[PDB]
Amino acid sequence: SMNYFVGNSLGVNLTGIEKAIINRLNLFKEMGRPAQCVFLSWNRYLYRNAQNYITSSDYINMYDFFQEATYLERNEDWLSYWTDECHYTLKHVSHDFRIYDQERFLMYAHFQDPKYRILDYVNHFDSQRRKVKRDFYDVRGFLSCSRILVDKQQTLCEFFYNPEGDTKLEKYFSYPEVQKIIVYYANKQYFFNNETELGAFFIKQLYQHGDLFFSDRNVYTAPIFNLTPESIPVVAVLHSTHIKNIDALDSSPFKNVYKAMFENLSRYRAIIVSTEQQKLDVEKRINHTIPVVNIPVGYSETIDTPVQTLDSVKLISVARYSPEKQLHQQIELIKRLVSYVPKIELHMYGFGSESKKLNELIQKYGLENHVYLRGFLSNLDQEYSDAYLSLITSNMEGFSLALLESLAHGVPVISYDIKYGPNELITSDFNGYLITKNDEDALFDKVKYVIDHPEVQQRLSKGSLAKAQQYSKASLIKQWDQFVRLILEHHH
Amino acid sequence: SMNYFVGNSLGVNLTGIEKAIINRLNLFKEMGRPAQCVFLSWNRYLYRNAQNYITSSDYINMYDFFQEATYLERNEPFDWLSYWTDECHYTLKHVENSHDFRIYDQERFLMYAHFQDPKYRILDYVNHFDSQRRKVKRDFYDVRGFLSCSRILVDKQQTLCEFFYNPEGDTKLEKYFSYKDGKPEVQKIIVYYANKQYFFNNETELGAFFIKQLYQHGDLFFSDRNVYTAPIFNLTPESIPVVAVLHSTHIKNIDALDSSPFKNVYKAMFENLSRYRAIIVSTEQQKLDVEKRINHTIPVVNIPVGYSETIDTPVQTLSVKLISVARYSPEKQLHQQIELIKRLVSYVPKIELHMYGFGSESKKLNELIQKYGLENHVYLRGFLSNLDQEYSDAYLSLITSNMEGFSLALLESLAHGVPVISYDIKYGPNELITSDFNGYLITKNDEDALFDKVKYVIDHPEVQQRLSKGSLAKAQQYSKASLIKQWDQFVRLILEHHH
């Protein structure tokens, strides 16, 4: 029996949902439940993005599936084919080419690498130089889709191929949205009006009695699941706040990405959220129509670096440089503290729009020896060892993997008491303090208190380690194990 | 070594060129030289049209060739209807007054199917529709059973591109179209051949590629549909020998031998004469004209386009029955034959004129017959495929045309012993008529001389008998065996010179 985690794709830079899905996959393998990520969009680069995270046997993409290119890995010279075997002439432009048959312009080629061992696309031209067809190659090397062009380079139809070149899907467009999909599957032909219907057909082919689906990218996956039979069990996963305005719990509309789910609640066996605090809110809002269960979206890995080698007082913030994170407040906090703590430092690890504003605010206060915008760091392990405490000054949060990591490194945290995440991970006077939202005077008081009393910081450090031990991998595994078993048990 | 007779296709009703190519194939087969008809146009009925006349191994069609369907015959019958209902679970709604079906998946309209036969055994096409009932694709089926071509539509069912498949469904050719003067015109052709891709701008270049794939040293090509085949051969190397075959007068204006432009259909051949090893024409008379016109730059040879079978049927069982075997078209001037009977009936009222053929002029000829009171004397017999019983009591054939070509019909009536009086017009009458031997040649449009000569033969049955015997003897010069000998000698000499 398989557990399927249904998102949409994998970007160059993984998103929160994409990381959550791969993480949940790893957890399931570890505990001995089979699991696979399920992807939907056509993405001829998907194998390239999966590479550093997940193996090809750990995912099924919908187009791969019908193109008979699932579980397929990279193929092992185009320029030697076009010259030595085909006798064409190539005039470089980029990593591009014009392919001529003697004097005749035939094709425009585009590669990725300067080794020109990975073909991207090839445009075809008629006798009047009209672009008639574009051939799109998969990073694994096979020809994946040819697009037929009309009028002012408008998409008329597209043909999708298996690696041997057989046509497996056809799409027909009017102005450009799909009006028709043809699929060659199981030795016959299937017809669909749109990609949502194609999605539901895919889900029905995947399912065998006993499997469980999770709906993770709900703006795409809920409409698909809404067209599949109720005998196919699926759980909805919310990775963010469920309503547009968190202060109108009862009346706020559901977020657009969650509408199709919440408007068909009876289709879902349960809803998963990351925090008890969110579970209680969602339960109330939906009048307990279906179960809601809190399962953390990550766990505390075992520590492999030195911990709490203190000496400079190092404050840290691990947060995207975004408005909601209200990072200027921490710069203000440092402006106040530095007169009491001359060797204080604040390191802020993240990225986003607020970079310029924040850096200029540092220049304005002369705090360039005290506050550092560190940018994004892949590995933060070395940064926590001398970290005295973490700061959260956000107006809104989600379950923080970063917070769990720093708590695992013994770094206590002072945070505003906003939904969702801090209440889950912080018990005041245990592993840190929760501060009234936007109360910057109380923030200053607690931060200064922990700095003034290193024995308080040490004790809050021991609480941090204990808080992290509560969210261990094994505790997380056991929550998922019992959830899946109980969901399936009730379905059948 | 193979001889290839390159025409375009075969219709349900064979044209003169198509007949000439099949006749030539049968002579080469009897002779023992390998021969094959070569066809160019995409025609998914071609196997059906060919079945009455040649075998599958007797021809190579260009599209069949690249579709890996050359020499393929008819598949076992397939009941698409049971496939669509029992296996696919579709709903089939018959269209009344048709062999058609609308095909549904529940409430969703998917497909419109057209069958050739009312037994629904020959699927012809299936149209596909999108969610807005737009017709986006047409699947065209070969009569042999396989899906031959899918046509992609745009806008108001205009042809954008076409994909051609082998019988297993692999794409072997692609064609892209742009419109001109309201019609689709090829702008690009892609061909999957020899594990490669080949690119062309038009059907002439594809044809030229196809000729090059067929040729091996020793082979010989005949260009029979020169409006298409000469532009093809002009794109092939002079190492490939080709003979141009003319099937009609070579110039627009027969009365300006030296200076008339060539007919449009022959223009590409005559403008590249050095490409061709020889020209074949049907009559000695045309040979002399063409030789003179091209200043003997390449050999010109006359070989008749068909042959005569000796007749076992009753012959000349002689009412005075005049006959005309002629399409009802203005060039034949059949109204003059009405005028002849109008004059003649006074002198023998037992006369009859039977006119075998069809065409636009039939109304006008009926009017004249009624006008002259000739309804019991002149008959428009329509088309008759077999004429053999009609020849047995025929006194005399008439030709009043202002232009002609070599006539297999006249050859057949001479084999049945029917003598002939004809205007002396090019081409054909001088080939098949020797004055006072099997008939008479009359100055063109001299109706009075026509009257006098016809009356003379009616008045002298012993002359009719003499001319009838000359007709038998004349026809026997065009025997199967004489034609074979001509073809054998020609091919021998052409190959020797080329090599």
Numbering used by the authors:
A (entry chain B): 0 to 75, 78 to 94, 97 to 178, 183 to 318, 321 to 501
B (entry chain A): 0 to 317, 321 to 501
Q: Which sentences from the paper describe this structure?
A:
Two glycosyltransferases (GTases), SdgB and SdgA, are responsible for the glycosylation of S. aureus SDR proteins such as ClfA and ClfB. SdgB first appends N-acetyl­glucosamine (GlcNAc) moieties onto serine residues (O-glycosylation) within the SDR domain using uridine diphos­phate N-acetylglucosamine (UDP-GlcNAc) as a donor substrate. The subsequent addition of GlcNAc to the glycoproteins is catalyzed by the second enzyme, SdgA, yielding glycosylated SDR proteins in which each SD repeat is decorated with GlcNAc disaccharide moieties. The glycosylation of SDR proteins mediated by SdgA and SdgB protects SDR proteins from degradation by host proteases, thereby circumventing innate immune attack.
Despite the biological significance of these two glycosyltransferases involved in pathogenicity and avoidance of the host innate immune response, their structures and the molecular basis of their activity have not been investigated. This study reports the crystal structures of SdgB and SdgA from S. aureus as well as multiple structures of SdgB in complex with its substrates (for example UDP, N-acetylglucosamine or SDR peptides), products (glycosylated SDR peptides) or phosphate ions. SdgB undergoes dynamic changes in its structure such as a transition from an open to a closed conformation upon ligand binding and takes diverse forms, both as a homodimer and as a heterodimer with SdgA. We found that SdgB and SdgA have a unique inserted domain, which is used to form a homodimer or heterodimer of SdgB and SdgA.
